[PDB]
Amino acid sequence: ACMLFVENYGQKIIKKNLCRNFMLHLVSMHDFNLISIMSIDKAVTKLR
Amino acid sequence: XXXXXXXXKXXX
Amino acid sequence: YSFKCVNSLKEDHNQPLFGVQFNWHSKEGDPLVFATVGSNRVTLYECHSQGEIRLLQSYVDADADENFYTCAWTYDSNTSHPLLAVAGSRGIIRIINPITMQCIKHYVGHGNAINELKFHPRDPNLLLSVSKDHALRLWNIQTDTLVAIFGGVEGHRDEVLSADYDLLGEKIMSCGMDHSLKLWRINSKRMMNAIKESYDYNPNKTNRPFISQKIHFPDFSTRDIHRNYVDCVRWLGDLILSKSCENAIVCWKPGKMEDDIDKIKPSESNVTILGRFDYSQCDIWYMRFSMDFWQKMLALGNQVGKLYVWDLEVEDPHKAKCTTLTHHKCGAAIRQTSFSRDSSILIAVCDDASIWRWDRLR
Amino acid sequence: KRVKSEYMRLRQLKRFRRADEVKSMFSSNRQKILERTEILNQEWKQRRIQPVHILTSVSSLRGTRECSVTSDLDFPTQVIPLKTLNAVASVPIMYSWSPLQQNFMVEDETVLHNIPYMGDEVLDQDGTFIEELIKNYDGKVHGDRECGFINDEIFVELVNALGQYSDKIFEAISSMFPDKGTAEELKEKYKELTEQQLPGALPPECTPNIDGPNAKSVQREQSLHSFHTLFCRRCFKYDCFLHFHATPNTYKRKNTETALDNKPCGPQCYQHLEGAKEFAAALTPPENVEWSGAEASMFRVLIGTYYDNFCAIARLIGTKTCRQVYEFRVKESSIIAPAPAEDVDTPPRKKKRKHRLWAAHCRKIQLKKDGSSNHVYNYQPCDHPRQPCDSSCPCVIAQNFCEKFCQCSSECQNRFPGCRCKAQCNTKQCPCYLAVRECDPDLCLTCGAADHWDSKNVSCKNCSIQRGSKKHLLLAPSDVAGWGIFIKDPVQKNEFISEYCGEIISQDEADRRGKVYDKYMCSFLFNLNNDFVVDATRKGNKIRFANHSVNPNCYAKVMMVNGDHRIGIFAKRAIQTGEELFFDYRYSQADALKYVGIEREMEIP
Numbered sequence A: 001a002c003m004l005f006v007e008n009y010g011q012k013i014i015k016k017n018l019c020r021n022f023m024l025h026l027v028s029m030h031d032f033n034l035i036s037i038m039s040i041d042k043a044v045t046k047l048r
Numbered sequence B: 001x002x003x004x005x006x007x008x009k010x011x012x
Numbered sequence C: 001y002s003f004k005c006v007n008s009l010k011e012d013h014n015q016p017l018f019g020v021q022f023n024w025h026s027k028e029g030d031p032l033v034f035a036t037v038g039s040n041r042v043t044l045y046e047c048h049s050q051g052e053i054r055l056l057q058s059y060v061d062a063d064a065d066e067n068f069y070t071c072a073w074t075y076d077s078n079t080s081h082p083l084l085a086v087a088g089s090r091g092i093i094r095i096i097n098p099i100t101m102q103c104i105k106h107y108v109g110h111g112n113a114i115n116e117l118k119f120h121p122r123d124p125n126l127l128l129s130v131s132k133d134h135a136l137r138l139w140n141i142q143t144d145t146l147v148a149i150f151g152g153v154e155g156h157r158d159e160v161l162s163a164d165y166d167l168l169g170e171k172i173m174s175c176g177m178d179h180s181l182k183l184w185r186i187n188s189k190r191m192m193n194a195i196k197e198s199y200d201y202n203p204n205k206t207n208r209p210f211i212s213q214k215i216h217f218p219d220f221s222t223r224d225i226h227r228n229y230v231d232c233v234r235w236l237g238d239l240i241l242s243k244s245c246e247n248a249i250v251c252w253k254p255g256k257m258e259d260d261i262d263k264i265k266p267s268e269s270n271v272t273i274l275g276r277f278d279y280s281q282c283d284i285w286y287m288r289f290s291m292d293f294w295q296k297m298l299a300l301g302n303q304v305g306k307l308y309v310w311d312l313e314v315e316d317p318h319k320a321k322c323t324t325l326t327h328h329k330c331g332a333a334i335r336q337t338s339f340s341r342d343s344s345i346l347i348a349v350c351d352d353a354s355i356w357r358w359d360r361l362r
Numbered sequence D: 001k002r003v004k005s006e007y008m009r010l011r012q013l014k015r016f017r018r019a020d021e022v023k024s025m026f027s028s029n030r031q032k033i034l035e036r037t038e039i040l041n042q043e044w045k046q047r048r049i050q051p052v053h054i055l056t057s058v059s060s061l062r063g064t065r066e067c068s069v070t071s072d073l074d075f076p077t078q079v080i081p082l083k084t085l086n087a088v089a090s091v092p093i094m095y096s097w098s099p100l101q102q103n104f105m106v107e108d109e110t111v112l113h114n115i116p117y118m119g120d121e122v123l124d125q126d127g128t129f130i131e132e133l134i135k136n137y138d139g140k141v142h143g144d145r146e147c148g149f150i151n152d153e154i155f156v157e158l159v160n161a162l163g164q165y166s167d168k169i170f171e172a173i174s175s176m177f178p179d180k181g182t183a184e185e186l187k188e189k190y191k192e193l194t195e196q197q198l199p200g201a202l203p204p205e206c207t208p209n210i211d212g213p214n215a216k217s218v219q220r221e222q223s224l225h226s227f228h229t230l231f232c233r234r235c236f237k238y239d240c241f242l243h244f245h246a247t248p249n250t251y252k253r254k255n256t257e258t259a260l261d262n263k264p265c266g267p268q269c270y271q272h273l274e275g276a277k278e279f280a281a282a283l284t285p286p287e288n289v290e291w292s293g294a295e296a297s298m299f300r301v302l303i304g305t306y307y308d309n310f311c312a313i314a315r316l317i318g319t320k321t322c323r324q325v326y327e328f329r330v331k332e333s334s335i336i337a338p339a340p341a342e343d344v345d346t347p348p349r350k351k352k353r354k355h356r357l358w359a360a361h362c363r364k365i366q367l368k369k370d371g372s373s374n375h376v377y378n379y380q381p382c383d384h385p386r387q388p389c390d391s392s393c394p395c396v397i398a399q400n401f402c403e404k405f406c407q408c409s410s411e412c413q414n415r416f417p418g419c420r421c422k423a424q425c426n427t428k429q430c431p432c433y434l435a436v437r438e439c440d441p442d443l444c445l446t447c448g449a450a451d452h453w454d455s456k457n458v459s460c461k462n463c464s465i466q467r468g469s470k471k472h473l474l475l476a477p478s479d480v481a482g483w484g485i486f487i488k489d490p491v492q493k494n495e496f497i498s499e500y501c502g503e504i505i506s507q508d509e510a511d512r513r514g515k516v517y518d519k520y521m522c523s524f525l526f527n528l529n530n531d532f533v534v535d536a537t538r539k540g541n542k543i544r545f546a547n548h549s550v551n552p553n554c555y556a557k558v559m560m561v562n563g564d565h566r567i568g569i570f571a572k573r574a575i576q577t578g579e580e581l582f583f584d585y586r587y588s589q590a591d592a593l594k595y596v597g598i599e600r601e602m603e604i605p
C-alpha cells in the first residue's frame, strides 16, 4: 500500500507540500510495526 | 403533553 | 383584502378534492383555464364574467384503484402545446395534453406516492419528485430521462411533502413530517454538468443506461423551526416563509441576518427566524397555501372554511394587520388553494368535492 | 426569579432596532423579486401558448360514463362524458434506500425526534403504543420548550445571576430550558467570558503541523498524540467507523535488528572523525549552524525511531549533514531522558506449545463457559498491562482467542494456532473452516490465504470477505412478495454468497425500532450477537431485497470476519441460471405465519 499510493499521489503531496507531516503518518506504521525501515527509504525517494 | 399527539391526515 | 366569493361549484364524485393548478404558463388575453385533480378524476375548467365557469374537458382514472394527490401544468416548446402532470397514491407521474387528448408518457420507479410536484422555473422539461418514498427523483420528461435522486444516505428518515425551487433556480427547499428542512444547491457544477449530458441521450448510444447522480449532503437543514410537522413552505425569493400545524407562520434565513444564502458553508447550522403572520383553527397538516404569480400577496383558507390572506409588500409582522376573508356556507375543509393569473380571481376548493370562487373587489 | 423576562426585555430592545432591519431585506428582496418576475414574464411573453379546445362526442366510445359538476349556485349544471386514462403496470413499493458494502456504528438515539404517520386504522385500538414508545424514549420528545436559546449579553447576564445583588435566577436558568446545563456551567462560562470565542481547532497551546512554518518545537509524544487518538489500528485506518479510543501504542521490541554498517558514508557523518565516532558508542562544540524548532520536532520524533542511525536522519532531512545532526542528537540527548531500547528472548523458545494444549485450554474454555454455545459477545482487545492471560483475561471472560490485535503477547496459548489446511481451508477437517473466521492471510499459507490477494483464483473457499468475491445480483418483483433478488450464474451447494452488510446497532434501539418497524411490518434486522444487532434499514447490501423459504436453495452462515461478527449466505443445493434466492429467517411460528406466511407450494399427496 505504501509505494502504490505514493506512486500516484506524491505529486499531490508535493503540491500540498505536507511532506514533513506525511512522514509523521509514516512514523506511526513503523511504530505500529506495519512497515519496517526498508520501505521508509522508498517514500522519501519518491518525494524526490 | 397531550398537544404533542398529532394524528391529522384529516381533522381531529 | 378586498374580495368576495362570487361563485361555487361541486363535482358529483364526492371523493376528497386535491391539487389545484392555474395555468400561469399561458399568454395574455388568451382564455384563462384552470385545472385540478380529485381522487381519480382530473379536472380542467375556465371561469368567466357574470360569475360563470364553463365546464371544460376533463378525464378520470378507471383502472388503477389509486387516489391522485398532486398535479401541475406542463408545456412543450416543440409542439407549442401546453400539457399538465398529475400524481397520487402510486406516484406514477402522468402528463396529458388536451390537444393530444392522451398522456402518452410513462414514468414508473417511485416507491409509494408523490407528495410534491414542480417543474423547474426555467426548464420546461424537469420535475423533481418528492414522494412518500423519502426520495427526490428529477425527470426530464422531454427526453424521457430520469435525473439524480437527492438525500439517500443522508435523506429524510421521515416523510417529506413540502419542497420548492428558488425563482432563479439554484437552490431547493424541502421539508415535511421529519420536521427537518434539508436543502440543496442546484448550481453545483456536478449537476450543472449532469443536466447538460442528461439533456442528450440515445438508448442506441451504448448498452450502459444513462447514469445520473446521487447527491446526499444538503446545504442546510434543521428541525428546531417546528416542534411538529412542517408542510407549507415556499421560497420568498431570498427569504423563506414557513409554517406548521401550530397555526403559526414565519420566515427564516440561513445563518444570521447579514449572511448571504450562497456564501454559507454546508456545515453551518446557525439559524435566523423572523415573521409572524399566523392563524388559528387549522391545527392539522396536509394543506397547500398559495402565493401570487406577482409575489405581492399571500393567501390560505382554513379547514373551517375561512381564509387567511395578506399582501407581500412593506406590510410586515411588526404588527401583522390581519385579513380574515371567509364565507359561512364553505366550512368543511379547504384542502387546496389557488388564484387566477393575477390578484383578481381565486378558487377555494373544499374537501367535499366542492369548489368556491373568490373574486377581486377592485 | 429567572432570566426569561429580562431576556424578553433585552430581546425587545434588540427587536426594536430590528424593525428597519427586518424591513430592509424584505424591501430588498422585492427588488430582487422585481427583476426576477419580469425576466420570467419576458420569456413567458416570448413563448406562445396554444388555446385549449373542449371535447366533442366520440362515436366509437359512446358506451361510457357521463358526469356533471353541480353548480353550488343557481347556474346550470353542465354535463360532460367521462373519459378514461392510459394503463401503467404497478411496481412494488420500496423505501428510498442507500447502497452499502460495509458496517457502521450509530450511537443509541436518546430522543423521540419523530412521530411517524401510520394508516390510522389500528390506532383506534392500540393507540397507546405511541406514548408507550415515548415511554421507551422516556418522555424525551422533539421540540420540547426549546425556543431558541440565550446568547451574547443575555448570556453574560446569566453570569451576573450567579452572584447576589439573584439566587433563584441562576437556579432557574439551570432548570427549565432543555439545554439548561447547570449553574456550574455558568461559572465556567464566566471564566470562558475572558475569551468568548474558541481558541482554535487545536489545544490552546501552539501545535501547528510541521509543514506549517509556525509549527512549535512540540515534543515527540504531544506531536504523535494526534495520530493515535484519531487513528485505529484495528481496521488500520483513521476513525475506523466500525470500531472512540483504542490503546496507547507503547510496546516492547528488540533494537538490535540493524546490521549496523556504520561508515563515513556521508560527508561529516558520525564518522569522518575518530573521536567523534568514539563518543558515539560511549554516549549511547557543534557548528554555528542553527536548528529550527520545526527541525527539532522530528529530532525527538526520530530519536525514538532508532536512537542510533544519525546517517538515516541525514538521509531523511537534507538541511545539514549527519554531523551537526549527530552533534545535535548528542546535544538534544544531553538534556532529555534516556530511551528503553531493550532486548528480550522470553522463557518459551520451542516445544511445550503443541496446539493440543490450546485445545486442552479449550476444554476449560468449553467445560465452563462455552457449553451453552450461544453466548457470543463482541470482540475486545484482551490487553494485559502487567498481568498474564489470566482467568480474568478480557477475551477469556469473553470466551474467545487472544487476537493478534490484542496485547496478550506471542507466548499466549489462547492465541489461535493456525490454519494448516494443505488442500484448502474450506471443508470439515479444516478447523479454521469450523472456526467462524475467514482463514487468516497470515495463517493459511497452506490454502493460498494471502497468495495473490489481488487475484481471484485459489483452492480455499473461506476467502470471500477478504477481497469481496461478490456475485451479480438481480432486481425485480419476487414470486412470493414484492421486490426480489435473483442470481445470474449457476453456483454449487456450500458456496459463498455476498455478506449481509448493514449498520450495527444496539438491541434496545432496534427493539424501539422493531416495534415501530413491526407496526409497519418492517425487519431489516439480523440478530448479530448476544450484545448487538445489524441494521439494514437505510444503508444496506444488495441482498437485502430477497425473500424467504422454508426449504430454500441457500442458507446463511454466521461469520467472524477478523474479529467482526458478520453474516454471509451459502447455497443449500444446486443453483443454475434464473433462480430465486431465499433463506430461513428463523422467527417464531406465530411470527412466521404473521410475517412470512407465504410458502409457494401445493398439496401433492
Ligand SMILES: Nc1ncnc2c1ncn2[C@@H]1O[C@H](CSCC[C@H](N)C(=O)O)[C@@H](O)[C@H]1O
Pocket: D092, D093, D478, D480, D481, D482, D483, D484, D521, D522, D523, D545, D546, D547, D548, D549, D594, D595, D596, D597, D598, D599
Ligand atoms: N415468504 C413470505 N411470505 C409472506 N411474507 C414474507 C415472506 N418473506 C418475507 N415476508 C415479509 O417481507 C418482509 C421483508 S421486506 C420484503 C418485502 C417483499 N418481499 C418485497 O421484496 O417487496 C418481512 O417483514 C416479512 O414479513
